Design goal:
By secondary structure, the protein is mainly beta. The chain has one domain (about 1-738). About 5% of the residues lie in helices and about 15% in strands. It is built from 6 helices and 38 strands. It has a 28-stranded mixed beta sheet. Strands 4-6 form a two-stranded parallel ribbon. The protein has a two-stranded parallel sheet with strand order 9-11. Helix 3 links the parallel strand 30 and strand 31 (about 565). It binds a molecule of 5 linked components (NAG-NAG-BMA-MAN-MAN) (2 copies), a molecule of 3 linked components (NAG-NAG-BMA) and 2-acetamido-2-deoxy-beta-D-glucopyranose (NAG) (6 copies). The site of one 2-acetamido-2-deoxy-beta-D-glucopyranose has 5 residues, from loops. One of its GO terms (biological process) is canonical NF-kappaB signal transduction.
Length: about 750
């Protein structure tokens, strides 16, 4: 009773089927009639008829995106499905909206299609529709033909997205129940008082990309004639009292009318990126009309040809009492003084200040102490010196600073700047910084224990992509509370023959939990051993453990409390038995992937009683031990993908703790009865076997019966478990055979 070709999983008593990216020519008739959600996306399906979903009467959600990776849908093909609530038909090259859609539809997505006419024959009958997506249809068809009153009968429509279409004007006769109206990149150059007549429950309005400021856009960008901006009438948003989100990004706006926000007391998010509002930032009457605004974005509003000495922030900025995040990227100015940010120091909830990509040469860092609740100071891509159609295409939605860093406390990001060395006055007059990012600064500082004395409570320090010298035993030891140190891609700049690398600084830390020394080109150590009582995770990938491997046999033996160790990309051909035995016994996860290991001594796993995860992927191993149970009694996950293993030993499954065995992309031709003969019951939950040259002859029948007898062992990617021989069964799955 194993499902094929879908990976069926019971989620909240509703069986879902994941049949995506499986190279399916047609809709499969081998799907259980009890499934509710079906995902047939990224397949080569070309035709949809009224017999495709025959028998599956409990289908509440159908996904047919990117088919074929156009789609021919007959009239009333989905009409038989009386329980269909969600239908996704994105990127299907549909010329028109499918006629005969079921009335029980609540969410319809027709994004990235060739739909030029929005007619009543395919839309008006769908009165239960709550969400309607019609983006990227008549994008770059001179204009989208919207039938007058096509959305009138949809009295339950809460979301209408007509983005990236040649609309030219807001469609009239829209339902009053509309909560979110998306009109981004719609060529609507004029907004009138009558355009949004009866939208009293409208909480979101997106009018971005209309008369745009072309700044490295991922989609075509054509500005309005004569540098014109979007023409919004004085009383256009006078009836939208419940507006919370207003997106006016890339609208070439030069002046903001404060009268727009007179009847908008709940406006929480205002987007004004890619405009020409430098004058509005300096005076702005509209700043007094936004008392409940929490997110304000005025990024990339710079004036061409000018690089002002200071940022001109209006005193009216003090009237944004609810402000939490201020985004001011791309303003482009030379210096930030304490007096420039005076109208922001009294805002009680302002926790995020985004000043990235501003080319600031010097900052008066004492001004940050003047703030009350600052938690994120993002200053990346500046000049500080020593001492997807479902995406937000204008606002930076991803976390400015990594969540694992910001969780420790006050976060300051000084990455991609001109701090080529840590000056003596580098961090003076700074708040109590708990997260610091000095990444990609070409920093060649010879660390000695005094550089971070002004900010000694840094718990997460990111020093990636620099030329730092940390050979001194006192390096970084002034950060007594340091928990996470990131030194990835650190190329030493002052290498001493009998000194580099000297990792003695690590043992001084009483609370260092995670150390990342990846891609540091560590081929020699000098006190050669690494010791630490608090270290839990060490990343030593992209180093030269092959050159090191008898002075470096017990290299990580002193890390008595280490649970995670990454030894990938070290060019290891053969790990010495004495060196492997001297690895920390406390290890729970060991990653020796992407190396060149020809042999692995499985007997050595006896000295690691807590080892649950063993990663040996991307290697050249040919043999497996026939008595793995005699060496381990805790190994829950064993990853051996992309190896040269051609035979599974007798009783390899007969280790009890093993719940995940990955033998994909190997050289296994067949799984014989000796390897499957288990007297004791196995506890395996997942067995990956795709990418193997299986012989689909009578020899594979023994393993075929084991798959039917053991339905608890989930085998993923059944369509990728391909037979190499014979010519008749070549290409077919091992589950589809006599
Ligand atoms: C102009 O400005 C407006 C306002 O900021 C932007 O509107 C946002 O647009 C994006 C993209 O269309 C919306 O993002 C999507 O939201 C969906 C709903 O999420 C909410 O609800 C769930 C619970 O149902 C919560 O868990 C969640 O926190 C939210 O509160 C998500 O389902 C979407 O997720 C899917 O897509 C993303 C991106 O591919 C994936 O990363 C996810 O894994 C997932 O597959 C997505 O997040 C956003 O909600 C809109 N805001 C509002 C308030 O509606 C405009 O986009 C912007 N215009 C332009 C052109 O930039
Ligand atoms: C230098 O080395 C360090 C240490 O290895 C790296 O930092 C770690 O990077 C990994 C990712 O490579 C981080 O792990 C990820 O954490 C995410 C957030 O975790 C929170 O949420 C989960 C629940 O979702 C909680 O359990 C957890 O406690 C946190 O609250 C997760 O979302 C990620 O999960 C995804 O990947 C894993 C596989 O890795 C899947 O199993 C998941 O299903 C999911 O897809 C992931 O776990 C880790 O947190 C980082 N540690 C620190 C200390 O920051 C550096 O990135 C590295 N530097 C460079 C330049 O490479
Ligand atoms: C410290 O600062 C550096 C530099 O700003 C941070 O590195 C940056 O991290 C982000 C997020 O991981 C990367 O963005 C992503 O890049 C990929 C590839 O281009 C893209 O596909 C994603 O959509 C996204 O934009 C960014 O490239 C990377 N920058 C560099 C130069 O490597 C780092 O994360 C910061 N560290 C902490 C602790 O916050
Ligand atoms: C649909 O689900 C119900 C249980 O919710 C079940 O009784 C019924 O037989 C199912 N019908 C089909 C056709 O699967
Ligand atoms: C600040 O945020 C809290 C919620 O975190 C809220 O209760 C409070 O009213 C906000 N203060 C102001 C002045 O907006
Ligand atoms: C805060 O800034 C004001 C000037 O804007 C200054 O007089 C005051 O001393 C500063 N206080 C601190 C603690 O930085
Ligand atoms: C190493 O650091 C200590 C402590 O700051 C310092 O006294 C010493 O001079 C440094 N060593 C070298 C070689 O600079
Ligand atoms: C091991 O590491 C954890 C996390 O850093 C720490 O809390 C614990 O005290 C350490 N245990 C010993 C015995 O050193
Ligand atoms: C494993 O290592 C031990 C020494 O620790 C050695 O005696 C044994 O022969 C090795 N086994 C293999 C298969 O190399």
């Amino acid at each position: 009773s194993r499902s094929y070709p879908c990976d069926e999983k019971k989620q909240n008593d509703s069986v879902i089927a994941e049949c995506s990216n499986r190279r399916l020519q047609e809709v499969p008739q081998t799907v259980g009639k009890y499934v509710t959600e079906l995902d047939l996306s990224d397949n080569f399906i070309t035709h949809i008829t009224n017999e495709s979903f025959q028998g599956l009467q409990n289908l509440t959600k159908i996904n047919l995106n990117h088919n074929p990776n156009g789609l021919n849908i007959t009239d009333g093909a989905f009409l038989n499905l009386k329980n269909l609530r969600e239908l996704l038909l994105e990127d299907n090259q549909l010329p028109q909206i499918p006629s005969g859609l079921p009335e029980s539809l609540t969410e319809l997505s027709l994004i990235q299609n060739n739909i030029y006419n929005i007619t009543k024959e395919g839309i008006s009958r769908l009165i239960n529709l709550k969400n309607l997506y019609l983006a990227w249809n008549c994008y770059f068809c001179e204009k989208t033909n919207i039938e007058d009153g096509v959305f009138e009968t949809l009295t339950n429509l809460e979301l209408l997205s007509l983005s990236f279409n040649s609309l030219s004007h807001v469609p009239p006769k829209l339902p009053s129940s509309l909560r979110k109206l998306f009109l981004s990149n719609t060529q609507i150059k004029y907004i009138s008082e009558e355009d949004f007549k009866g939208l009293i429950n409208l909480t979101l309005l997106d009018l971005s990309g209309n008369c745009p400021r072309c700044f490295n856009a991922p989609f075509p960008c054509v500005p309005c004639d004569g540098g014109a901006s979007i023409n919004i009438d004085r009383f256009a948003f006078q009836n939208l009292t419940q507006l919370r989100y207003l997106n006016l990004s890339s609208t070439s706006l030069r002046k903001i009318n404060a009268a727009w926000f007179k009847n908008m007391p709940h406006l929480k998010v205002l987007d004004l990126e890619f405009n020409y509002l430098v004058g509005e930032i300096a005076s702005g009457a509209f700043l007094t009309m936004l008392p409940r605004l929490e997110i304000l974005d005025l990024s990339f509003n710079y004036i061409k040809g000018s690089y002002p000495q200071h940022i001109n922030i209006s005193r009216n900025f003090s009237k944004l009492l609810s402000l939490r995040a201020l985004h001011l990227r791309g303003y482009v100015f030379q210096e930030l003084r304490e007096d420039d940010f005076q109208p922001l120091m009294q805002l009680p909830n302002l926790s995020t200040i985004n000043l990235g990509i501003n080319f600031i040469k010097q900052i008066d860092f004492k001004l940050f102490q003047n703030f009350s609740n600052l938690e994120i100071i993002y200053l990346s891509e500046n000049r500080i010196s020593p001492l997807d159609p479902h995406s937000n295409f204008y606002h930076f939605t991803r976390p400015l600073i990594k969540p694992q860093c910001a969780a420790y406390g006050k976060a300051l990001d000084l990455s991609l700047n001109s701090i080529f060395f840590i000056g003596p006055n580098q961090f003076e007059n700074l708040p109590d910084i708990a997260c610091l990012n000095l990444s990609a600064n070409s920093n060649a500082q010879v660390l000695s224990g005094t550089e971070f004395s002004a900010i000694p409570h840094v718990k997460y320090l990111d020093l990636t992509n620099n030329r730092l010298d940390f050979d001194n035993a006192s390096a970084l030891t002034e950060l007594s509370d340091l928990e996470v140190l990131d030194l990835s891609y650190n190329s030493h700049y002052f290498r001493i023959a009998g000194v580099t690398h000297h990792l003695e600084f690590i043992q001084n830390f009483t609370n260092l939990k995670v150390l990342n020394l990846s891609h540091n080109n560590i081929y020699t150590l000098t006190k050669y051993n690494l010791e630490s009582k608090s270290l839990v995770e060490l990343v030593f990938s992209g180093n030269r453990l092959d050159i090191l491997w008898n002075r470096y046999i017990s290299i990580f033996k002193g890390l008595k409390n280490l649970t995670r160790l990454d030894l990938s990309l070290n060019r290891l051909k053969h790990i010495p038995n004495e060196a492997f035995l001297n690895l920390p016994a406390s290890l729970t996860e060991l990653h020796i992937n992407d190396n060149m290991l020809k042999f692995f001594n499985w007997t050595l796993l006896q000295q690691f009683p807590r080892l649950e995860l063993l990663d040996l992927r991307g290697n050249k191993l040919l043999f497996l031990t026939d008595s793995l149970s005699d060496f381990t009694s805790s190994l829950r996950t064993l990853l051996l993908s992309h190896n040269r293993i051609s035979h599974l030993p007798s009783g390899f499954l007969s280790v009890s703790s093993l719940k995940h065995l990955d033998l994909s992309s190997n050289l296994l031709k067949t799984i014989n009865k000796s390897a499957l003969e288990t007297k004791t019951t196995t506890k395996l939950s997942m067995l990956e076997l795709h990418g193997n040259p299986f012989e689909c002859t009578c020899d594979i029948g023994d393993f075929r019966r084991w798959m039917d007898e053991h339905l608890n062992v989930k085998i993923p990617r059944l369509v990728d478990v391909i037979c190499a021989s014979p010519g008749d069964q070549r290409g077919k799955s091992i589950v589809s055979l006599e």
